[PDB]
């Protein structure tokens, strides 16, 4: 009663979590999804801050420290009970157990995905009004522009597979937190699995619903003083469009995200510990 | 009974905390507010110490390590029960529940804000008498001068939004500590959320009530040996005035601080878990 | 009842773990072995990510930080209950106690080894489809090529002894986690012992069932744009063949792995605490 | 009963600690004071070791890592129950409660201060006999000489105020450990507050009773091979005398140390939580 | 019952530990001593790995990180119950209490010292067969050669005093682990005290029974390709002999080790908390 949960018990807590989430009031789900969109946006802002000025640093060392900074948003989601689309894909365990319906799964996923977008877009506005892009002599905004520009240059299969790898890591972090009982147990078990996906360039749909939109805003409304300082032009980031974001990144990464956490984490552990 | 609190229970502990704080004796509130002004001043002195000599270092890596150093002051506030204006804005949860009155909220906020200023100003005196500005051949005082000078060059909207972002981070750190039961749980859950706001250049009213006043004192009473060593003049910091501090930074950052923690952390979680 | 287990009690939990593992359903053992093959593959991908760009860094400092990144896969195996061939060699404690049969030990080892290979090979496919080898301008794939190429140049005795050293470290990490009761205890006790084997270049059979196969795939299907960027040719990695992998690395490292954990960790602790 | 102590309860544990310490047998107090003098000496030796060779490093980053190394001595004092003059100043809480007499407070302070000096001086002897000053080609002894030389060049007010700041940090670390219940809680809560005072150049009387005496011994008995390697002469450290130590540093820093922890930590918390 | 042990209770657990250790079966003591010789050998191999390539790094920063790597071996000894000669010197507390006889103390010390040598020498063989000396282009073996060569150039008094300082640190780490109740408490309380002795160049008899023997083996059986790569000759390490090891290092460091932990940690704490 003070010891970590075992893999069979962690599977039952995952099942009850999905029964709770899918049966919560819709507006509560939307409000918790807006907080999770804001939490993932804060974590990406922390990642961009920590990775500003790190071109002289070893590539993997810079990516790792920024990945530990991105871990805050997932810890916030778990401790504060926010609804993140990636983690909410694990309600498939409750679906496989027949404890929830397909319409309950579909309505919860649309509520969380849409709310996560509203929260991520609201944080872009506040981040734009803060003048943060001009930090480090515009190097903060150039980091966002360069991060957002690469996330739109992947092929469909590359984006789907990068999404599978990201939600596998996120859902394994959320699954391992089920074993935890304290706040330190749950939080620290999630640092390394998130650092990994962020350092390894895996794609998360909600994280990208903040990064690419923010880079599109910088390219469009950045000052000429920004372009002078960073020594570039908006035409170097011409492919940073809303349509390129949905087609090139959002659609394939989201498809991959569902497959990663749903099939690999959720349905595997249901087969091993719950199908019985 | 050994496990972390859940989001609904954390909301009730936030409500009872505000009922406690707003109903404490006024002089106890003033004395705890002076300690919190001193605690935030110590954390900024630690930030300045850690970030002295870091112009050769990657911008975000230097900001992150100084942000972990600033986390000490918030941990001190939480463990030692000090009254910080930013965290005391969460007494709006008790106000929304009708458990406290508007005059109780207004009197507690003025008591904490004024006491936080007295504590921050008392630490400036002790820091000035210590000769700390001449540390690192005056590089410690130049770090304070350069930090204080930028905090006065923001537009009203930029300062308000930077204040919203800071108190959102501070109040989310304080909210997540409510889940904690041990000293390690509460303290470590607050490191990354504070590092973020400090590394990301967000503005905290009480932190600025120490930084800018300290930079004004250095500009005015620094020795000619200081200006020789740092290779600058007081005229490079002409906009570091008390009037510029209140108008350019204090008023807008404080307005933003109330909106960040009160509306975003407090009233959101009251709607989701307490409005019932 | 809240204190760490003592060496005698940790030996009994090791015995009961082997009785559980060897008596689990075969398909459950195969499925948990596929997850462990994927978990060790994720840890090596994290190691490669963190160690990309670190030729300018001190050799041991770069190896140590990548070793902490590889620790995630073992933590995942322990918390999520996955079957790793290295840790499953400790079922020899149950065999020595006469609590399991030799055919039970042989069938479990073949089930785990084969499943660990399937999981490691499935992750190579996903990693190849992600385009990750072209990360850091191909420096990610060159790190894999250079890591895989050295792991095939050892003599039989060197490979056997490097395998003994690796499984001694892995099984001592798994043994020390038996003392732990919380998730933080079990996880953190395993970081330094795994970092050591990874930093010290010891050889793990399942880790190599991902690294060398992945390097063979890069050498064979890498783009000419990859070879241009990394400034090399596939002929620099001619000895990266499937046959060289089995003979030069897989067979001797696996023999060594059994001796390291089975004889040194398992049969020693059985003699001291269970032979009674 | 598993949760951290609250500020009111931490004040009562501080009161009972002072009643215990002031009423312990005098020889037990002297022996525990000699251990605390040795513990603070070990922490300064660790600080000097970690900060040797760090002139190429950013000033604050080098000071911070050495400050975490100095934290060991305070952790040792708290866990092993040693009597450190700085922490024993908090017996003023028991004095203010009328639970101890003024003669009990005076006799305990003289016993601890004298014993702390004996322990610090005994460690200087062992450190001198070890030949440690010649480590890093004499750079270890030059670090001690340069650290000790600056600690004697402060004005009386600067030294008193640097002593107030040091014992405020030390006594706040000791106060926050009262909230802790486990060994990890108590130890980790004391790392950042001690790192701060060490990184920020604050002055501790017992730490200086090891540093300056050790630098005086190096200046006087260092080999000519030492002066050749470090490229200096004893005449560069002419002000490192026993009389300069007492007048320039010991007397004012000790006065400041009493004011810092006694008045600021002890009498403040007694007014807020115990004067009732 | 969940709180750390107090200094008086930690003294009684130290007394009962020595009564257990000295009364264990001799062959169990020999087998646990062989594991401790292997555990300290692994920690030194980790130290050498982490400190390879660190001549460009600040001396103290490199020594500190390698010292955290050496901490693994002591954690392993404590968690896995191994018999290390340094920690077994604390059975003097049971001897002083009259709970064990002088012949029991002498027989246990010889059993542990001899077994620690067998384990350290067995790990040298495995490390030699692994080809690890050629790691980092022979820089791993040169680090061992340079570490082993300096450990033989100390005077008798320097070696005795460096041994006193090492076992004081090791026995204080073991004493502080007695306060711990969890695996994280016991393990983390031992990291900084061990890092200190390793970073500060203190001498441990069992650690040296692996380092110097390993350097003698490299000097004697290293390939001419090793000497070419490292750009040296065996004649640069002529004083690395077995006879120089015993006389110059083993005998004086062991004498010092007994005095450090026995008299300073054991007999002091027995006088303060057990002589009653």
CATH of the domain at E212: 1.20.1080.10
Q: What is the CB neighbour count within 10 angstroms for residue D128?
A: 16
**C-beta separation of A261 from A87 below 8 A:** yes
**C-beta separation of E57 from C64 below 8 A:** no
- Those residues whose C-beta lies under 8 Å from the C-beta of residue B55, and which sit 6 or more positions away, are none
Residue E200: how many CA atoms within 13 Å on its side-chain side? 34
Closest chain E CA to residue C60? E50
D201: left (phi over 0), alpha (psi -120 to 50) or beta: left
Dihedral pair phi/psi, residue E80, rounded to 5°: -85, 5
Name chain C contacts of E29, Cβ cutoff 8 Å: none
Is the CB of E189 less than 8 angstroms away from the CB of D62?
Answer: no
Residue from C36, C34, C100, C110 nearest C74 by CA: C36
Q: What is the CB neighbour count within 10 angstroms for residue D103?
A: 9
- A214 occurs within a structural domain: yes
- Those residues whose C-beta lies under 8 Å from the C-beta of residue D270, and which sit 6 or more positions away, are D11, D15, D92, D93, D96, D97
| Total domains present in chain A | 1
Is the CB of B162 less than 8 angstroms away from the CB of A65?
Answer: no
What is the resolution of the experimental data for this entry, in Å? Answer: 2.6
Residue from A70, A258, A263 nearest A160 by CA: A258
E181: nearest CB among C2, C180, C268: C2
- A157 occurs within a structural domain: yes
Residue from B164, C110, E205 nearest A42 by CA: B164
Dihedral pair phi/psi, residue C208, rounded to 5°: -80, -25
| Pair of tokens at residue C116 | 């660990």
**C265 vs B64, C111, C253, C269, E21, CA distance in Å?**
41, 22, 17, 6, 21
- Those residues whose C-beta lies under 8 Å from the C-beta of residue B269, and which sit 6 or more positions away, are B7, B10, B11, B14, B93, B175
C98: left (phi over 0), alpha (psi -120 to 50) or beta: left
Is the CB of E272 less than 8 angstroms away from the CB of D136?
Answer: no
- Those residues whose C-beta lies under 8 Å from the C-beta of residue E56, and which sit 6 or more positions away, are C58
Question: Dmax over Cα atoms in chain A, in whole Å?
Answer: 64
A-contacting chains (≥3 CB pairs under 8 Å): B, C
* CA B216 – CA B241 distance, rounded (Å): 6
Dihedral through CA D195, CA D196, CA D201, CA D203, nearest 10? -80
Residues in chain B preceding a C-to-N separation beyond 2.5 angstroms (breaks): none
* CA D97 – CA D101 distance, rounded (Å): 10
**C-beta separation of A95 from A105 below 8 A:** yes
| Pair of tokens at residue A178 | 């089920």
* CA C229 – CA C133 distance, rounded (Å): 11
* CA C165 – CA C253 distance, rounded (Å): 10
* CA D84 – CA D78 distance, rounded (Å): 9
Residue from E118, E139, E165, E110 nearest E226 by CA: E139
Rg (CA), chain E: 19
HEC-encoded secondary structure of chain C: CCCCCCHHHHHHHHHHHHHHHHHCCHHHHHHHHHHHHHHHHHHHHHHHHHCCCCCCCCHHHHHHHHHHHHHHHHHHHHHCCCCCHHHHHHHHHHHHCCCCCHHHHHHHHHHHHHHHHHHHHHHHHHHHHCCHHHCCCCHHHHHHHHHHHHCCCCCHHHHHHHHHHHHHHHHHHHHHHHHCCCHHHHHHCCHHHHHHHHHCCCCCHHHHHHHHHHHHHHHHHCCHHHHHHHCCCHHHHCCCCHHHHHHHHHHHHHHHHHHHHHHHHHHHHHHHHCCC
Q: In B58-85, which positions are buried (b, 16+ CB within 10 angstroms) versus exposed (e)? A: bbbbbbbbbbbbbbbbbbbbbbbbbbbb
E268: nearest CB among D31, D65, D132: D31
The number of residues making up chain D comes to 276
- E1 occurs within a structural domain: no
Dihedral through CA D8, CA D9, CA D14, CA D17, nearest 10? 160
Instruction: Find tokens 């795939």 and name the residue.
Output: C217
Q: Give the residue from D147, D184, D192 with the most E CB atoms within 10 Å of its CB, the best one to mutate.
A: D184
Residue from E7, E94, E35 nearest E269 by CA: E7
| Contact status of A209 with chain B (Cβ, < 8 Å) | no
| Contact status of E103 with chain C (Cβ, < 8 Å) | no
| Pair of tokens at residue D240 | 């490192």
The number of residues making up chain B comes to 276
**C-beta separation of E270 from E94 below 8 A:** no
User: Which residues of chain D from 233 to 262 reach within 8 Å of chain B, CB to CB?
Assistant: none
- C39 occurs within a structural domain: yes
* CA A30 – CA A37 distance, rounded (Å): 10
Residue from D77, D88, D81 nearest D111 by CA: D88
* CA C6 – CA C16 distance, rounded (Å): 15
- Those residues whose C-beta lies under 8 Å from the C-beta of residue C5, and which sit 6 or more positions away, are C13, C178, C179, C180, C181
* CA B206 – CA B223 distance, rounded (Å): 27
* CA A202 – CA A204 distance, rounded (Å): 7
Name chain B contacts of A130, Cβ cutoff 8 Å: 158, 161-162, 165, 202
| Contact status of A180 with chain C (Cβ, < 8 Å) | yes
* CA E184 – CA B185 distance, rounded (Å): 14
Å between D160 CA and nearest CA of chain E: 31
* CA C108 – CA C102 distance, rounded (Å): 10
**A184 vs A123, B176, C4, C167, E146, CA distance in Å?**
27, 11, 18, 29, 42
* CA E273 – CA D80 distance, rounded (Å): 11
* CA C21 – CA C31 distance, rounded (Å): 13
* CA D248 – CA D245 distance, rounded (Å): 5
| Contact status of C135 with chain A (Cβ, < 8 Å) | yes
| Contact status of E56 with chain D (Cβ, < 8 Å) | no
Residue from B18, B28, B149 nearest B82 by CA: B28
Dihedral through CA C55, CA C56, CA C61, CA C64, nearest 10? -30
Name chain E contacts of C63, Cβ cutoff 8 Å: 49-50
Dihedral pair phi/psi, residue E27, rounded to 5°: -70, -35
**C-beta separation of B71 from B190 below 8 A:** yes
**C-beta separation of C37 from C117 below 8 A:** yes
Dihedral pair phi/psi, residue D215, rounded to 5°: -65, -40
Q: What is the CB neighbour count within 10 angstroms for residue E183?
A: 26
Q: Would you give the distance in Å from CA A234 to the centre of its chain?
A: 27
* CA D95 – CA D153 distance, rounded (Å): 35
* CA C52 – CA E38 distance, rounded (Å): 32
Residue from B207, B196, B183 nearest B81 by CA: B183
Residue from E180, E208, E262 nearest E40 by CA: E208
* CA B257 – CA B275 distance, rounded (Å): 23
Instruction: Find tokens 């260092």 and name the residue.
Output: D222
Quickly list DSSP for A66-112: HHHHHHHHHHHHHHTT---HHHHGGGHHHHHTTSS-HHHHHHHHHHH
DSSP state of A3: S
Dihedral through CA E54, CA E59, CA E63, CA E65, nearest 10? -70
| Contact status of D54 with chain B (Cβ, < 8 Å) | no
DSSP state of B154: S
* CA E54 – CA E33 distance, rounded (Å): 32
- B9 occurs within a structural domain: no
Question: Dmax over Cα atoms in chain D, in whole Å?
Answer: 64
Q: What is the CB neighbour count within 10 angstroms for residue C155?
A: 12
Instruction: Find tokens 């030729």 and name the residue.
Output: C55
Question: What are the residue ranges of helices labelled H in D130-202?
Answer: 139-150, 156-179, 183-188, 191-199
Å between B162 CA and nearest CA of chain A: 6
* CA A84 – CA A167 distance, rounded (Å): 11
Dihedral pair phi/psi, residue C5, rounded to 5°: -70, 155
- Those residues whose C-beta lies under 8 Å from the C-beta of residue A254, and which sit 6 or more positions away, are A85, A113, A163, A205
Q: How far apart are the first and last CA of chain C?
A: 25
D-contacting chains (≥3 CB pairs under 8 Å): B, E
Residue from D199, D158, D251, D257 nearest B128 by CA: D158
Helix (H) or strand (E) holding B105: helix B102-129
| Pair of tokens at residue A193 | 């699995």
Q: In B228-244, which positions are buried (b, 16+ CB within 10 angstroms) versus exposed (e)? A: ebbebeeebbeebbeeb
**C-beta separation of C197 from E43 below 8 A:** no
- D3 occurs within a structural domain: no
- B16 occurs within a structural domain: no
B53: nearest CB among D6, D60, D192: D60
Residue from E192, E186, E11, E183 nearest E90 by CA: E11
**C-beta separation of B88 from B265 below 8 A:** no
Q: Give the residue from B59, B67, B187, B269 with the most A CB atoms within 10 Å of its CB, the best one to mutate.
A: B59
Query: Could you list the residue range(s) of the whole structural domain that residue A59 is in?
Result: 24-271
- C31 occurs within a structural domain: yes
| Pair of tokens at residue D134 | 């010649």
Angle between helices D205-221 and D139-150 (to 10 degrees): 120
- Technique of determination: cryo-EM
**B237 vs B145, B216, B245, D194, CA distance in Å?**
7, 9, 13, 33
* CA B262 – CA B188 distance, rounded (Å): 23
Residue from B46, B44, B220, B38 nearest B121 by CA: B38
DSSP state of A4: P
Burial label for D64, CB within 10 Å (0-12, 13-18, 19+), is buried
| Pair of tokens at residue A8 | 């069979």
Q: What is the CB neighbour count within 10 angstroms for residue B134?
A: 19
Angle at E128 between CA E122 and CA E131, to 5 degrees: 145
| Contact status of B204 with chain A (Cβ, < 8 Å) | no
Helix, strand, coil percentages in chain D from 3-state DSSP, rounded to 5: 80, 0, 20
Closest chain C CA to residue E82? C7
* CA A65 – CA B192 distance, rounded (Å): 12
Name chain B contacts of A1, Cβ cutoff 8 Å: 2
| Pair of tokens at residue A187 | 């939080």
Angle at E264 between CA E259 and CA E266, to 5 degrees: 95
Angle between helices D59-79 and B59-79 (to 10 degrees): 30
State whether residue A151 is helix, strand or coil: coil
Burial label for C58, CB within 10 Å (0-12, 13-18, 19+), is buried
| Pair of tokens at residue D103 | 């003669």
C-contacting chains (≥3 CB pairs under 8 Å): A, E
**E10 vs C6, C152, E90, E92, CA distance in Å?**
17, 51, 12, 15
User: Which residues of chain C from 60 to 89 reach within 8 Å of chain E, CB to CB?
Assistant: 60-61, 63-64
DSSP state of E3: S
Rg (CA), chain B: 19
Name chain B contacts of A72, Cβ cutoff 8 Å: 192-193, 196
DSSP state of E6: P
Quickly list DSSP for chain B: --SPPPHHHHHHHHHHHHHHHHHS-HHHHHHHHHHHHHHHHHHHHHHHHHTTT-SSS-HHHHHHHHHHHHHHHHHHHHHTT---HHHHGGGHHHHHTTSS-HHHHHHHHHHHHHHHHHHHHHHHHHHHHTTGGGTTTTHHHHHHHHHHHHTTSS-HHHHHHHHHHHHHHHHHHHHHHHH--SHHHHHHTTHHHHHHHHHTT---HHHHHHHHHHHHHHHHH--HHHHHHHT--GGGGTT--HHHIIIIIIHHHHHHHHIIIIIIIIIHHHHHHT--
Instruction: Find tokens 């009690």 and name the residue.
Output: C9
Angle at A109 between CA A103 and CA A113, to 5 degrees: 150
**C-beta separation of A18 from A95 below 8 A:** yes
Residue from E199, E202, E196, E184 nearest E252 by CA: E202
* CA B218 – CA B84 distance, rounded (Å): 26
Is the CB of C161 less than 8 angstroms away from the CB of E126?
Answer: yes
Residue B276: how many CA atoms within 13 Å on its side-chain side? 10
Q: In D65-96, which positions are buried (b, 16+ CB within 10 angstroms) versus exposed (e)? A: bbbbbbbbbbbbbbbbbbbbbbbbbbbbbbbb
Residue from E262, E243, E240 nearest E251 by CA: E243
Residue from A20, A45, A30, A123 nearest A83 by CA: A30
- Those residues whose C-beta lies under 8 Å from the C-beta of residue E247, and which sit 6 or more positions away, are none
* CA C69 – CA C62 distance, rounded (Å): 11
* CA C148 – CA D132 distance, rounded (Å): 44
* CA E84 – CA E70 distance, rounded (Å): 14
Quickly list DSSP for B23-42: HS-HHHHHHHHHHHHHHHHH
Helix (H) or strand (E) holding D22: helix D7-23
Å between A70 CA and nearest CA of chain B: 10
Helix, strand, coil percentages in chain B from 3-state DSSP, rounded to 5: 80, 0, 20
Burial label for E13, CB within 10 Å (0-12, 13-18, 19+), is middle
E2: nearest CB among D57, D181, D188: D181
Name chain E contacts of C7, Cβ cutoff 8 Å: 79-81
């Amino acid at each position: 009663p003070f010891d970590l949960l075992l893999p069979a018990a962690m599977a039952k807590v995952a099942e009850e979590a999905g029964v709770y989430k899918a049966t919560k009031h819709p507006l509560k789900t939307f409000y918790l999804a807006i907080t999770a969109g804001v939490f993932i946006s804060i974590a990406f802002v922390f990642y961009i801050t920590a990775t500003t000025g790190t071109g002289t640093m070893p590539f993997g060392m810079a990516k790792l420290v920024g990945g530990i900074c991105f871990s805050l948003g997932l810890i916030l989601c778990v401790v504060c009970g926010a609804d993140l689309f990636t983690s909410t894909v694990l309600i498939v365990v409750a679906k496989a157990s027949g404890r929830i319906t397909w319409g309950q799964l579909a309505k919860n996923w649309l509520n969380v995905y849409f709310g996560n977008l509203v929260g991520a877009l609201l944080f872009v506005l506040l981040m734009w009004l803060s003048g943060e892009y001009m930090t480090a002599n515009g190097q903060w905004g150039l980091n966002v522009l360069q991060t957002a520009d690469h996330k739109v240059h992947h092929t469909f299969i590359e984006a789907v597979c990068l999404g599978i790898l990201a939600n596998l890591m996120v859902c394994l972090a959320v699954w391992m937190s089920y074993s935890g009982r304290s706040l330190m147990d749950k939080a620290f078990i999630m640092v390394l699995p998130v650092a990994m996906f962020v350092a390894s360039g895996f794609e998360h749909s909600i994280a990208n619903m903040f990064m690419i939109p923010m880079g599109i805003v910088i390219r469009d409304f950045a000052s000429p003083e920004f372009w002078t300082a960073v020594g570039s032009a908006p035409e170097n980031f011409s492919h940073l469009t809303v349509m390129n974001f949905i087609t090139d990144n959002l659609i394939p990464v989201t498809i991959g995200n569902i497959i990663g956490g749903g099939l690999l984490v959720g349905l595997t552990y249901w087969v091993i510990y719950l199908r019985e």
